[PDB]
A paper describes a structure:
The connexins are a family of transmembrane proteins (21 isoforms in human) that form intercellular channels for cell-to-cell communication. Intercellular channels are constructed by a dodecameric (12-mer) assembly, with six subunits assembled into “hemi-channels” that dock together through extracellular domains, resulting in a continuous ~1.4 nm pore for intercellular permeation. Here we present an electron cryo-microscopy (CryoEM) structure of native connexin-46/50 (Cx46/50) intercellular channels stabilized in a dual lipid nanodisc system at 1.9 Å resolution—providing a near-atomic level of detail for this class of membrane channels.
Structure determination by high-resolution single-particle CryoEM resulted in a high-quality 3D reconstruction, with an overall resolution of 1.90 Å (gold-standard Fourier-shell correlation (FSC)). A bouquet of 15 ordered lipid acyl chains is held in place by each of the 12 connexin subunits, which appear to buttress the channel assembly by filling a cavity formed at the lateral subunit interfaces (blue). Remarkably, all of the resolved lipid densities in the CryoEM map are specifically localized to the extracellular leaflet of the bilayer, indicating a selective interaction with the local lipid environment. In addition to stabilized lipids, 396 ordered water molecules are resolved throughout the channel (33 waters per subunit). Pore-bound waters localize to regions of the EC1 domain and TM1 parahelix, and mediate an extensive network of h-bonding interactions, involving D42, F43 (π-bonding), E48, Q49, N63, and R76 in Cx50 (positions 42 and 43 are Glu in Cx46), and several protein backbone interactions. Four additional waters are buried at the lateral EC domain interface formed by neighboring subunits, primarily coordinated by hydrogen-bonding interactions with the peptide backbone and sidechains of Q49, D67, and E208/E196, in Cx50/Cx46. The degree of coordination of these buried waters suggest they contribute to the architectural integrity of EC1/2 docking domains and may in part explain why deleterious mutations at D47, E48, and D67 in Cx50, linked to cataract formation, disrupt junctional coupling and/or biogenesis.
Residue numbers in the entry:
A (entry chain B), B (entry chain C), C (entry chain D), D (entry chain A), E (entry chain E), F (entry chain F): 2 to 109, 149 to 236
Write the structure that this text describes.
Amino acid sequence: GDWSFLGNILEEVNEHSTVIGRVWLTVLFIFRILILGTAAEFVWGDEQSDFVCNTQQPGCENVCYDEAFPISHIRLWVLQIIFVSTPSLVYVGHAVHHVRMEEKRKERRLEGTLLRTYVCHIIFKTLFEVGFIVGHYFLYGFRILPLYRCSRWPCPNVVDCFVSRPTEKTIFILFMLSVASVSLFLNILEMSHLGL
Amino acid sequence: GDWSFLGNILEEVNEHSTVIGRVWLTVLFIFRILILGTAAEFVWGDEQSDFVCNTQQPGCENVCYDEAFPISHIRLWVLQIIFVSTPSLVYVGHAVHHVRMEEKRKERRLEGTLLRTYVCHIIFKTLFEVGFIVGHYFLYGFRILPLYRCSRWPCPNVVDCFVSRPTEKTIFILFMLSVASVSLFLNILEMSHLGL
Amino acid sequence: GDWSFLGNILEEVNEHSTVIGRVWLTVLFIFRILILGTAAEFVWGDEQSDFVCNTQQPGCENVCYDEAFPISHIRLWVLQIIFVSTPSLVYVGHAVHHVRMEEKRKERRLEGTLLRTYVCHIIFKTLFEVGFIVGHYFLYGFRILPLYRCSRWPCPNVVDCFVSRPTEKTIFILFMLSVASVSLFLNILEMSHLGL
Amino acid sequence: GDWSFLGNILEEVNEHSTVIGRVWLTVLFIFRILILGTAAEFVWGDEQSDFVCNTQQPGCENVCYDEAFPISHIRLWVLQIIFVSTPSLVYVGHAVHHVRMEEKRKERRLEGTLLRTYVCHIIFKTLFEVGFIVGHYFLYGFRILPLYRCSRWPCPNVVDCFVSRPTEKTIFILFMLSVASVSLFLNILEMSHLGL
Amino acid sequence: GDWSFLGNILEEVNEHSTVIGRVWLTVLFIFRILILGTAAEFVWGDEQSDFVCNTQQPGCENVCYDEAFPISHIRLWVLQIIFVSTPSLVYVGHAVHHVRMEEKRKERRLEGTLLRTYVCHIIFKTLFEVGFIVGHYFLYGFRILPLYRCSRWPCPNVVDCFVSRPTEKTIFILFMLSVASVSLFLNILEMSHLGL
Amino acid sequence: GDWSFLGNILEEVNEHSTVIGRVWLTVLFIFRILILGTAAEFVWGDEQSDFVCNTQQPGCENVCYDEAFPISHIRLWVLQIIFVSTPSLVYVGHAVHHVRMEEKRKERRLEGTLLRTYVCHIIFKTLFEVGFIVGHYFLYGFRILPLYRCSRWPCPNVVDCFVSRPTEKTIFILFMLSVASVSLFLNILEMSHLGL
C-alpha cells in the first residue's frame, strides 16, 4: 500500500490548517496509516489461511470465513482513512483555487467562504468518523472471539471454526477505536476554538 | 504495481486542466489507484489458491477457476484506469507541444484547438468509462456468489466450486462501480461548465 | 522489477525526440512497463505452482511445464522492452556526445549525422519489434489452451497437464501484441513524417 | 513498514534538540527501527506458521498460539517506538508554532515555555519507555522457552506446543531491552545536563 | 535487491569515463542489473522448492540440490557485477581524490597517473569478467539439463532428481554469457581507442 | 531491510573522513550491505522451511533448528554492520557538533580533539570487527555441514537433520569473513597513515 499521493496532498494542507488540524493530520499519519502498514497488515495477513473449521466438507471454510468476515478490519480502516481525509482535500482544493484566482486576477487566510468550507469539512470528517465507528460496532463489535459457529451451506449442521490471532486483533481493534475517538475530540476542539 | 510514471504525467496535467478535471484526477489517484493498491489487490490475492472445488478430478479446479474468472476484476480495473487516463495524456501532449512550439517560434489557455482537444478527451474518457462499466456488467454483473457450478472438461458432470471472499469482493465491486459513476458525472459537469 | 534506470534514460531522450517518438515512449512506459508490473506479472505469478498434470510420476510436471513454457511470456516481454529501447539509448548517446563535444570545442537539432542515427534507430526498433512478434507467434502463437499433452521422459506415455489461467493469459497476450503493433505503426509514421 | 513520515518529522526535530536528544534520535533510527526492519521482522515472520502442537484437535494450535502470544513482540516494539516518539512530535509542534507566530508577528532557543515543554517531553518519553519495559516483562518476561503447555479449549487436557526460533527471539528481546534502557539513561542525562 | 548505492556511484563515474566506458556502464545497468531484477530473479525463485527427487529418503533432496547447485547462478551474477564494478570505483576514487586535492591546493582530464589508473581498471575489469566466465563454465557449463543424478549420502544408491525450469534457465545463462562477452569486447575497444 | 537512514548518515561522514575511511565506507556499502540484500538474504530465506529432520516426533524439527542456528548468520551480519558503523556516527556527531559550535560562536580539520575521537573510532571499529569475527568462529566456525545431529528434547535419542543450502551458505560465510578482514586491514592502514 503506497500512500505517497495522499500523503503529499495532506501535507500540502498542513500549511493551510489550524494548529489542531495539524495535530489531527499528524495523528492520521502516525497512529493510523503507519500502524496499519507496520503492524495491523501483518496481523491480518494470515486471516483466511489460518482460519480453520472442524469439518471434512469441501467449501465450508470458504463460506464460513466469508460470513464471519464480510470485510476485513484492515480494508475497513483503509476506507475510513480515505473518507475522513476526503474533506481535507476538498478544502485544500477550494483554497488553492482561490490562490490561483488571486494570481490570475492580479495578472488581469481563513475568512469568508474559506471559513464556511473549513467548518463544513470538519463537520463531514466528524460524521464520517462517527459513521465508520458505528458501522464497525454493528458489524463486528470491538472484540474478536476465537470460536465462530457457522451453519452456512454447504456446511453440515453447525460447524466450529477458529479465528487467527483473536487477541492481537482485539488489541488493534480497540487501539484503532481509541485513535478514531481522539480524532473526533480534536475535531470538536477545532469547532470550539473557531467559535471562541 | 508502480504507478509513478503515470502519476507524474497526470500531475503534469493537473496544472493544465479545469477545476473539475482536477477533481476527476484526485478521484483517480485516491479512490481508484490507492484503493487498488492498499485494499483490492490483497482481497484478490488468494483468488485461485483459496478457490476450491468438490472433486477428485485432476485439472478441474484450474478450468473452473478460469471459466468463472476469465479476467480478474483487479486486472480489469487496472486496464480501465490506464484507458481512462490515456486521453488526458493525449491532451497534455498537445498542450506541451504548443508550449514548445511557442518557445521555438519565439526563438525564431484553453482556446482554439486546445478546446476541441479537451472536449474530445472528455468524450473519450466518458465512452471508455461507460464501456468498462458495461463490460464488467455483462462479464460478471455486480455480485460474486459463493457457489459456482462448473461442467468444463475434465470435470465430471457438474461440480460445485467455492469462491474466495465473495462478500468482500462484492463490496469492492460496488465501490469501484460507484467511483466510476462519480467520474462519469464529473465529466458531464465538465462539458456543461465549458458550454456554460 | 525496478525500471528506474531505463526510465530516467528514456525520459532524457523524450526531450531529444520527435513528437511521434514521444508518443512511442509514452506507450512504452504506460502500456508495456506499467501493464507488466501492475497486471501481467501477477497473472503469471503462479504459472508453475498451479500447473498440474494427471500423473503419479515424479518429475513429470517439471519437464512438462518446461516443455510447454520454455520461456515465460513475461520474461519475453521484458527482453522485448529492453531490446526495443536499446536503439533509443544509442541515439541519445550520440546526441549527448555531440552536446559534450560542442561544449568542449567552445572551451577550446536533428540534422546531419544525428538524422542518420535517428533513422537507423527507428529501423532497428522496427526490426526488433517484428522479430519478437514473429518469435512469440512461432513459440506460442497467440492463444494458451487449458490442456497441454506431454510425452517427455519420465512421463509415462502421454499425460494430460492443465495450465493456470489460460484465458486471462490469452487476453494479455493479445493485448501485448496489439500494443507492439501500435508501436510499429508509430515507427512507420515517424519515417513518413521525416520523409515528408 | 514505511517509516518515512515519522523519520522526516523526527529529523526535523533533530535540528531543534539537544546533543543528547540527537543521540537519542539516532539510537531510535538505527538500533530500533532499522533492527526491526532488517532483522526482527524476519525472525518473527514464521511465528504462527512454524508454531506446532502435538495434537489432532482442530483449532487447538490457533488458540494455543493466541494464548502464548497475545501480541507479537514486534508489534509491541512498533507501538513502543511510536509512543516514545510522540512527545518529540508534540515539542517540535510547539516550536514550529512559535516560529510561525514570530514570522506572523513580524509581518504584523530553548527558553521560556519551550523549556517546560522540552522537559515534559523528556518526562513522558521516560515514562512510556518504562511502561513498555514493565509491560513486556509482565507479559512475556525476557526469555522465550521452546515449550509452551496449553489447556485452552478445544485442546484436550494439556497439549505440548513448540515455539519457532525461541533462542533467536530471546536474543532480540534482550537486545531491544538493552536499547530501551540506553534510551532511558540518555533521557536521564538530558535532564541532568539541563539542570546543570 | 537495492542497487541504488552502486548505481549512484557508477553514474558519478559516467561523467569521468570514455564514451566506450559509458557504453559499458549502460550495458551493466540495463542488460545485467535490470535483467537480473526484472527477469532472472523470478526464474530462479523456485529453484529449491520445485526441485524434486524420486525418493522417500529424508534429507536426500536437500543434499542433491546442494550438490547440483553449490551456488545459484543469480548469486554468481550478483558477485560478478560487483567485482567488475569495483575497479570503476577505484578509478573514480582516484579522480575525486585529485579533484579535492586540486581544490585544497588552490585554497593553499585523463592524463598522467589517471591514465595509468584507468588502464589498470580496464585490465582488472577484463580479468574479472574472464574469471567469472571461466568459473561459470567449469562449475555448470552453459546448459542446465532437466535430470540430475545424485548419489550423495543419505540418498540410497543413485536417485533421479529433476530441476526447475531448465530451458528458461539455459536461455538466461546464454544471455548473460553473451552480455559478459560484449562487455569484454567493449573493454578491448577501450584499450585500442586509448592506444590509438 | 531499509538502510536509507544509516546510508545517508554514513555518506555524511564520507566528506569528513580520510581517503582510507572512504574506502572502508565504500566496502561497507557495496560488499556488506549490498551483498546482504541482493544475495545472502535470499540464500537464508528458506533456512527453517527447508530444514528437515528424519523423525515423526512433533516439535523436534523446531528445537533442532533452534539448537543448530541460535541466530541466523544474516542477523549476525546485520548486527555487525550496525556496530561497526556506530563509531563513525559518534565521530560525525562530534564533528558536526563542532561545526555548529563554530557557527554559533561566530554569531556570538582533523586536529585537536577530533583527532583523538577519530583514532578512538578506528579503535572501536577494529575491536567490534574482531569481536564479531571471533564470535562467528566460536558459534558456527566457517563451514556449514549438511548433517546436524540433534538430541534435544522432545527428539527421541539422536535424530539426523539436514540443513538447507550448506555449500552456498559456506561460500557466503567465507566471503563475509574475507570482507571483514579487509576492513580490519583498512583500519590498520588508517592508523599507520595517521601516525606516518
